[PDB]
């Protein structure tokens, strides 16, 4: 009879996409009103599970991911999209039955002169897979030439910095995102 719904949704240290944070929470069963009192928060897609269907009978385990992203790319934190944050930074499965929650952090994550701490990967010699994480900081070989493990032609640092400044337009402003995966495989409603 205990739940955390303040630790991940109320934290001033959100993680970037290349290191999408994931915290797990079991034996919980918290209600919906705890997560239905935070202003408009853009629009929260809840695939499979219907939003207002929490109650008690539900899933077992849960893996909650959190990161940041410009609002142009929130549509990419969704099944099927092929945008830069998806096929190169963070891919959601096609059978995804979790949920997505997004809001603006221009009030806090963006800083004057640039909060370049928040970043994202743009070059990767391969596509990503569901719930996969890559933290490699290794020069990207792009054209046929044995990259000397160093920066140069066809050899770029795989991570670009967002670097937010509050005056940016809504599209380039810092949205904060949290996805709520779900699984009820051979277990007694771990959460529920």
């Amino acid at each position: 009879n205990l739940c955390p719904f303040d630790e991940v949704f109320n934290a001033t240290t959100f993680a970037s996409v290349y290191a999408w944070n994931r915290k797990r929470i079991s034996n919980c069963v918290a209600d919906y009103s705890v997560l239905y009192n935070f202003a408009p928060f853009f629009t929260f897609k809840c695939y499979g599970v219907s939003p207002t269907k929490l109650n008690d009978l539900c899933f077992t385990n849960v893996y909650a991911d959190s990161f940041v992203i410009r609002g142009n790319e929130v549509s990419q934190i969704a099944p099927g999209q092929t945008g830069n944050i998806a096929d190169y930074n963070y891919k959601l499965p096609d059978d995804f039955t979790g949920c997505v929650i997004a809001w603006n952090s221009n009030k806090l994550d963006s800083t004057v002169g640039g909060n370049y701490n928040y970043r994202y990967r743009l070059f990767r010699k391969s596509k990503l897979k569901p719930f996969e994480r890559d933290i490699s900081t290794e020069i990207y070989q792009a054209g046929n030439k044995p990259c000397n493990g160093v920066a140069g032609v066809n050899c770029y640092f795989p991570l670009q910095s967002y670097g937010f400044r509050p005056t940016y337009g809504v599209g380039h402003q810092p949205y904060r995102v949290v996805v709520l995966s779900f699984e009820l495989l051979h277990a007694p409603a771990t959460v529920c």
């Binding site: 640039g114 743009l122 070059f123 792009a142 054209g143 046929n144 032609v153 066809n154 770029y156 670009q160 670097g163 400044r165 005056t167 940016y168 337009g169 809504v170 599209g171 380039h172 402003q173």
Partner: protein
């Protein structure tokens, strides 16, 4: 594997991402300088700009390493060539420093040139504003003669040798970059290649401009005869009824715009012009309401509304006594979703029209934002200002002013004030077309080397007489350089943009009014509440510069080539009225005349 095209796409991706950040840095620095003139912001602007310049030079080298010969995606190839432009760096470093020294030197001679009246060697007057108001508000032929000759003597004589060497070095620069002269470099803006059905040689610009000017000549002849008549009244013994109009009498120091002469050439003086300024001040109208009405216009045609960044980050009034800021109305696209307008708005009709014009700039910027960074611009050098002018013209129509409430519900037009309106409009619009053509042609032939130097200050006036219809009030030897006395000639700005923009804006407006189902004379059409003209204009605005200028021209006006016919179709009523009022006047002029 890894074909060159894929590698170039990767490079351009890295560029389009880091550039955007640096361009935002420099744009925001420039904005904080122009909204608050403090030395600190000045320094930050210079720093950000020089860093952006170094970034672009380095990336230009790295992009020139890519080969345009083996790239089969034009949307990529255009960005590549645009960044590949090596520029004046091809000149010898010594020659590059000399050229840049000459550019800044002539620009500072212009911006620091003054004429000291012999009345008092202590007292002097600069171009801005002393000489300008002397030449734009006085009627005394002697004083205006003095000012014309004085600014062309103290300043132009200096700018002569520098501009000579300038021709030399710019020719070398363009010959290196594989252009037949610096004029070919300037004409290469309308160059379209590799797209069948839309390509445009760099000399087809010359042919189309000359042929279109041939079609413009008659309206300018009748306007010249009428203006010559009214001025012949003004000055009782100073212009030949068959002679070229004198120079220091045209309205400005160079004669590029005849708009001032309106006060002496109004067809019906008793008929006042339409100015709602008092009506605005008397309806609680604030600059907020001005820009809201602009938003409302662009919304009524279908285009989006200004982002909250504009309604929150833009200076739409004079700040105050404490702050000091630039007030020349400017449209700013800092990128990354940030669009602003800098304007020290006053409750006048001029600022109402200018607000619509600059917000049209802003809407054009918002449309071409989805494109890659290098491809975020106007289709050519005259597309932007043309868009702004079509906004101003749709606004000024008495129909629109009625709709917004700044006009009475039953204000009935009179043909005399439509003649006055069309005549003022033609004094500005039509009057500057021969000037622009003549001056740009002089520069073009000089860069080709057809005009020998010892025959410079000669040929100019010949063209001035044979094309513009203006006589020099004083004989000038080659120790002068009156060309260089213009701001654009000594500050190295291609000129033909204004001629083009004019023809463009009229073609645009006529096509849009067609979509908007307006009937009657073209100067009475308002695109308001018309969604279809908005969609058409947006189909042009979204492309930015990803497709050729001919294609966007077809996307709006429905044709691939420039055509004066919309412009003449706009000014035709005035044309008839001129022909009438000039029945008893000689139409045309004669080279021979000259008050000497």
């Amino acid at each position: 594997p890894s074909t060159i095209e894929e590698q170039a796409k990767t490079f351009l991706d890295k560029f389009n991402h880091e550039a955007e950040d640096l361009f935002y840095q420099s744009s925001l620095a420039s904005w904080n300088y122009n909204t608050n003139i403090t030395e600190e912001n000045v320094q930050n602007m210079n720093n950000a700009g020089d860093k952006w310049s170094a970034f672009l030079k380095e990336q230009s080298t790295l992009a020139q390493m890519y080969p345009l010969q083996e790239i089969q995606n034009l949307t990529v190839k255009l960005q590549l060539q645009a960044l590949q432009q090596n520029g004046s760096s091809v000149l010898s470093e010594d020659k590059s420093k000399r050229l840049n020294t000459i550019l800044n030197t002539m620009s500072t001679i212009y911006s620091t040139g003054k004429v000291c009246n012999p009345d008092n060697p202590q007292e002097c007057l600069l171009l801005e504003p002393g000489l300008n108001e002397i030449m734009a508000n006085s009627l005394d032929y002697n004083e205006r003669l003095w000012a014309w000759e004085s600014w062309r003597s103290e300043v132009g004589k200096q700018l002569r040798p520098l501009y000579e060497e300038y021709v030399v070095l710019k020719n070398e620069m363009a010959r290196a970059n594989h252009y037949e002269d610096y004029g070919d470099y300037w004409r290469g803006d309308y160059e379209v290649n590799g797209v069948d059905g839309y390509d445009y040689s760099r000399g087809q610009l010359i042919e189309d401009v000359e042929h279109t000017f041939e079609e413009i000549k008659p309206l300018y002849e009748h306007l010249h005869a009428y203006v010559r008549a009214k001025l012949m009244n003004a000055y009782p013994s100073y212009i030949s009824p068959i002679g070229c109009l004198p120079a220091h009498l045209l309205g400005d120091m160079w004669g590029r715009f005849w708009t001032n002469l309106y006060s002496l050439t109004v067809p019906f003086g008793q008929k006042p012009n339409i100015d709602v300024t008092d009506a605005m001040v008397d309806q609680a109208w604030d600059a907020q309401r001005i820009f809201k009405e602009a938003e409302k216009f662009f919304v009524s045609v279908g285009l989006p509304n200004m982002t909250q960044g504009f309604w929150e980050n833009s200076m739409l009034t004079d700040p105050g006594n404490v702050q000091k800021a630039v007030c020349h109305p400017t449209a700013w696209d800092l990128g990354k979703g940030d669009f602003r307008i800098l304007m020290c708005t006053k409750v006048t009709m001029d600022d109402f029209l200018t607000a619509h014009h600059e917000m049209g700039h802003i809407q054009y910027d918002m449309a071409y934002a989805a494109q890659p960074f290098l491809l975020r611009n106007g289709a050519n050098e005259g597309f932007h200002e043309a868009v702004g002018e079509i906004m101003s013209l749709s606004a000024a129509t008495p129909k629109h002013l009625k709709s917004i409430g700044l006009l009475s519900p039953d204000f009935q037009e009179d043909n005399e004030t439509e003649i006055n309106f069309l005549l003022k409009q033609a004094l500005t619009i039509v009057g500057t077309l021969p000037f622009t053509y003549m001056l740009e042609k002089w520069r073009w032939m000089v860069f080709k080397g057809e005009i020998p130097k010892d025959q410079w200050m000669k040929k100019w006036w010949e063209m001035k007489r044979e094309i513009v219809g203006v006589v020099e009030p004083v004989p000038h030897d080659e120790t002068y350089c009156d060309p260089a006395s213009l701001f654009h000639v000594s500050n190295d700005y291609s000129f033909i943009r204004y001629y083009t923009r004019t023809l463009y804006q009229f073609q645009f407006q006529e096509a849009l009014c067609q979509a908007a189902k307006h009937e009657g004379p073209l100067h009475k059409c308002d695109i308001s509440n018309s969604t279809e003209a908005g969609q058409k204009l947006f189909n042009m605005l979204r492309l930015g510069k990803s497709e050729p200028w001919t294609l966007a021209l077809e996307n709006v006006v429905g044709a691939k080539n420039m055509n004066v016919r919309p412009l003449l179709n706009y000014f035709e009523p005035l044309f008839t009225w001129l022909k009438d009022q000039n029945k008893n006047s000689f139409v045309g002029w004669s080279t021979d005349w000259s008050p000497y």
